[PDB]
Amino acid sequence: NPAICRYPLGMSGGQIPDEDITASSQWSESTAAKYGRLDSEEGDGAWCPEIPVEPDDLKEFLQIDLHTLHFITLVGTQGRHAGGHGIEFAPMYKINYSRDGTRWISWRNRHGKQVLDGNSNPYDIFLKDLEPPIVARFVRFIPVTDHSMNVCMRVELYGCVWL
């Protein structure tokens, strides 16, 4: 199934409109949620929280509304390249998702681990398979750090429409 259900869902291509991308906070209008699209250089290069992310206080998030239920098999993330001088990225992150938009589900891999290893630099696209895959309308990327740091993220969701 994951062989056919592996298509980018709209972050890089624009299929997912700006209005459907929101966040917990933003450093500036130029780093608002809508700029958190994989490989984009628009605005100041990515979505970036207003304050540093602390290791014991995971309160930031980048939220995508797909409107209809989708099967999400992989996710991709990047930091903020910004023409070559950006240094911000999320080293790790968690994925929360929802069907109704009211109750949130914490994604856990087959071993019960919620934290996914992320980027190690601001420019490379890093992909992660989701096993088990998720069915959701809303997907949230929650940056996770091991020390206080100013993160930024550009992302993409891969999968297909449900039913």
């Binding site: 130029s30 100041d44 290069g45 023409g83 001088h85």
Partner: peptide, 28 residues
């Protein structure tokens, strides 16, 4: 009739890009 005067100045340019990230902090 005489040509009209030159048009008015154009719109203001777009905001500049973000400043570079600051330098590394001091030693612990």
């Amino acid at each position: 009739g005489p040509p009209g005067p030159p048009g008015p100045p154009g719109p203001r340019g777009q905001p500049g890009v973000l400043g570079f990230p600051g330098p590394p902090g001091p030693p612990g």
